[PDB]
Amino acid sequence: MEPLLLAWSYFRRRRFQLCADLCTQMLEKSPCDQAAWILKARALTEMVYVDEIDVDEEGIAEMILDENAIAQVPRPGTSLKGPSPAVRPVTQAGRPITGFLRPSTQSGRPGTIEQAIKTPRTAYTARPIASSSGPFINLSRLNLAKYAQKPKLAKALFEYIFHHENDVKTALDLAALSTEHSQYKDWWWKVQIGKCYYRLGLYREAEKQFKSALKQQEMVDTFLYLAKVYISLDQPLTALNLFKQGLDKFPGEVTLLCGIARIYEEMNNISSATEYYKEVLKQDNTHVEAIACIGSNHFYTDQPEVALRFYRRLLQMGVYNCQLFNNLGLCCFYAQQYDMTLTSFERALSLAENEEEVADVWYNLGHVAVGTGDTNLAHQCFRLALVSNNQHAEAYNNLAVLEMRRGHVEQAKALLQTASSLAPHMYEPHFNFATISDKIGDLQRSYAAAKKSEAAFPDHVDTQHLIKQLEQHFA
Amino acid sequence: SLFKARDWWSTVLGDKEEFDQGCLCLADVDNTGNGQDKIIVGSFMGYLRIFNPHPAQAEDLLLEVHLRDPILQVEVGKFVSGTEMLHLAVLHSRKLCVYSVSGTLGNVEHGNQYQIKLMYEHNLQRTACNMTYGSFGGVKGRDLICIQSVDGMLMVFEQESYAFGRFLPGSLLPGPLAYSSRTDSFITVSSCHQVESYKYQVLAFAVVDWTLNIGEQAIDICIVSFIQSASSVFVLGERNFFCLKDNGQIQFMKKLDYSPSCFLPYCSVSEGTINTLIGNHNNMLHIYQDVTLKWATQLPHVPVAVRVGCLHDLKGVIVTLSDDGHLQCSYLGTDPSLFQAPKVESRELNYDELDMELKELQKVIKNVNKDLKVSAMVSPNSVTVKVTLKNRVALQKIKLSIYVQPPLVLTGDQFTFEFMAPEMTRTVGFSVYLKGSYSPPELEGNAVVSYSRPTERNPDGIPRVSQCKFRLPLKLVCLPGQPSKTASHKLTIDTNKSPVSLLSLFPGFAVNVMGFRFLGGSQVTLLASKTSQRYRIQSEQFEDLWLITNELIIRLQEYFEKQGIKDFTCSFSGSVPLEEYFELIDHHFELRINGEKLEELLSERAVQFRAIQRRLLTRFKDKTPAPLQHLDTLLDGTYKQVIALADAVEENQDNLFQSFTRLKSATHLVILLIGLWQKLSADQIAILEAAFLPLQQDTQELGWEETVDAALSHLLKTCLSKSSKEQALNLNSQLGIPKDTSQLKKHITLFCDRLAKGGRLCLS
């Protein structure tokens, strides 16, 4: 009923708008009521709130021009820097496609700055890569020295400045003043200062605060932050040890186990990533990350029925996407559940909300067509994958294969060149171009293409045979 | 049906209502003594509704009373002094009211009535937010209640008597309040993320027993006491789930990856653990033993309060209530339904309609293999041109744009017509003038319009484009001047008619030996030969000959057609220059090579600057002092060199552009002379104009020489040459910057001479 009471109830219920508006009203009506002020702050900052553990974002500057790793040639297995590319598709040369996109996945690192600007903006990130990673209250006006004396206002105002205004400098100033006031004996302000430092790029001054907070109160968030720091310094084994210490404190925490699995899967050790994802399953059994990762892995290691079980589980728990339904249609067609494939593909096409998702669904429908044995429907599906996303190297490769099957060698050559220019990390257009070049002579381009094939997927046997043939011809 | 909240007695509970936590309650408010439960629901309007579901129907609603003021909290307990019978306490902002739901039977199941009799009421001098109840202290057979005002004040009422009220210390917003009996303590979650436990006697005597800095603020707090083996205080934070010991520290905690709304720890099944139940804002319930997820099921609505009760001979029924009004009893669905397409026989495929459409579309497919007029008018006088564009349908998203030349400039470049209704006319007017020094390669101009035709397949319409050309007057970039006599470069065009008076063709340039000066300084001379039928054009620059030579020819044609004569040629006996042409090609290529060298120099300077800047950065990161003036005085030098090289690259780009514009006119004239010299048809002239005049300016991946050389090699290879060794060794088409213009010049001379030897141009 009353203004403040109803604003509180709205905020509790995650309205975040009715309480904000009613707070504007109650503030204009009575210029002296700080409860409504901090409540409007909370509503504002929680409309936009995002988990800081998951906000790991890396720009080109932080990839190339920010050096913080101690070693330079660490032993293989002690730094972050399965199905072969002949089975599991790849996003870059290494790091085949995953089952779960978090906003911190890397899937490689661009070498130079030229290598990074001249590459599709979502090749090493889960969002377009950057160069670096009226109003409510005016930040310059309010004096943090006054708010930091009272923590009830201090914590909410800090959350507002750090998560809404995104001004890490004023946030760190308020956090420093507030930690001064509280005589350095509350873990929360330590963790907030650590987050501010980690944003500013000072990973050791942030590790210091996370460590000083763990000594005060062992909480899941501090372990996740500290492992995030230890991974920013490129020390995966320190992070694994910290995670295991956390799991010693919290005997079954799913976030720690999933962090361990993410590390083991970024070190490209799927044998332990899958074991820790299986532990997460033994704990959660609705975990989207664990189920998607084990499901993809099962699909690609000659077990589409088990992957179908896992994705059907994701569908039972109320997930309704374009990716989920594409995956379901694929696992159905390959598990030989021919009665549930094409309806899942149509549902996926319905749910698609991009032009890359539509292109991927038409690409997979073209694969279903190729399997069914009709190259005309396959032709149309690959061409529609191109219509929906012109930079779809796989559609070009498969369409060129079908063309070369028809007899159109020049069409196939141009399409394979476009593909191998769009995705240089893909061995298939390189190998195809080299093969149909050697078939017609032109051993120069045949060799130039076999070399890039072997650069993309080196243990490929046919590429080795072709390279040896061409090197014999050269001598 | 697996992992879905299978429905039971359920009903929507009003007309745009509003409920919160503490509204939904579930107990034996009727005091039947049997053991079933009755769903009690207050509202933020006043509708106190009590139901007894009997699975909706109409016997369910025991009563639907409407009190005036909103109902913040509803609770059921021994709220009356003498009797030990459960009563119903209802909390409004400024009122506490304890009723007594007494039901008296009728001879028929729809004749029994229920009345809520006000057993007492307390006025609140403060605006409440919630309340809790328990046996404050160790008193038995009583449930006396503590109400938390919204301004942080615990007003404790022992039933029927306002006991006292203590201001909670250091609180701005109000938080969730709970009461522990194993420790006789109130427990709050204040605004500074501090879970605080106060002892009841310390409050009655007035401080804080203990505190715990959880990382957030709490929605709900449930001190569950069905089990006495070990008391534990559960806390639902706005991001985390906690279970805390009785001394204060964390017994365990889970980091929810969702936004919880309500939670309820119901009875436990194992030894020591406690099953708990948490609802998402993703409308899903999670069953968690300790922190382990034991089940998860999809709710219909985002619950605002969940309970678990025994309703009509069924234990453990889940009772959810939203803030819209969806009240629902439910159980958990445990049927892993098979995944199989339905085997329906009625529903079959209407092959006839579908096949008609498929034949239609396949017809369009097999057919694909086998409406706006634009006109530009140039005024005869910075000349003002007007473009008139007209339609015949209702075109949409129309855009008109004009492209003249690099030197020439327009005052208006783009015109946007969002929609023009059918058979209508639009007319734009712009003005073009020379800006620069050199003369443009052609006084032509192009106006291109792009629109969308609304169709049946696509309501945004197919995109279509149509263009028109206009021809600017020579007197825009020229004026008459003093005719020189002996110039360096000259070319003679011979005609088969009588030599015409120059004052006829150029009447604004007055004299039967004429002279032209262009804006910029270039000067050309036109000599009408008096004994021969020819004319001669001369100038010190081979490029400036093209504009006058073009206008001579064009206006000769126009004059002889106006008169009425038909027979007319411009034979141009002699030899195509090919020597004052190659000088411009060599100049252009020298500028290109200079630009590439400067770009490499700038690459090196930028790499060096980056290295030094990174050194300085690492120096800035270190806490300890360190002398560095050497480093910043290296940086300043490298930066001034970078600025120098950038300005030099800009200068070379401009010089290269001017060289390209002069070369365009040179090659225009050369194609004209080759067409007059071998009597080339219009198509054979268009092939030359496409091979020799490729692009508008040089770019860092495509330039002029590469393109023209590839095109000439292809034409020589598939039109003129016969031997294959030559077709494979000399005649090679590549598209990278060359090392020298030797091949381009070899191919241009070979092209000229093999045209002279009878060869003619084709395409395939």
Next chain:
Amino acid sequence: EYHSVHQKLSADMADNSNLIRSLLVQAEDARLMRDMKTMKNRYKELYDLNKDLLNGYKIRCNNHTELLGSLKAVNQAIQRAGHLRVGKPKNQVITACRDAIRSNNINMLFRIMRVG
């Protein structure tokens, strides 16, 4: 206050260093497309940021050397207090002063340096 000033200066210099790395990337981009106006503007901004950061470095190192002087003064004072007493009281006074400064109990520090 030396601690606080150093913290604020390090924060500001981290901000400006991130800015400078972003500008390095942006300048490399503008130079890869031979866009010289924007490249020269990035280089101007880099020059200005380097000037400001060098001023910040000077002031930070000055305050930092003053901080080292203060820390040495404190430690040498604890040592001068301990060195005044022979035997087992020495490390007693030393650890007592260390605990009285880790808790910022300055008055107890001077009490234990006077008689304790």
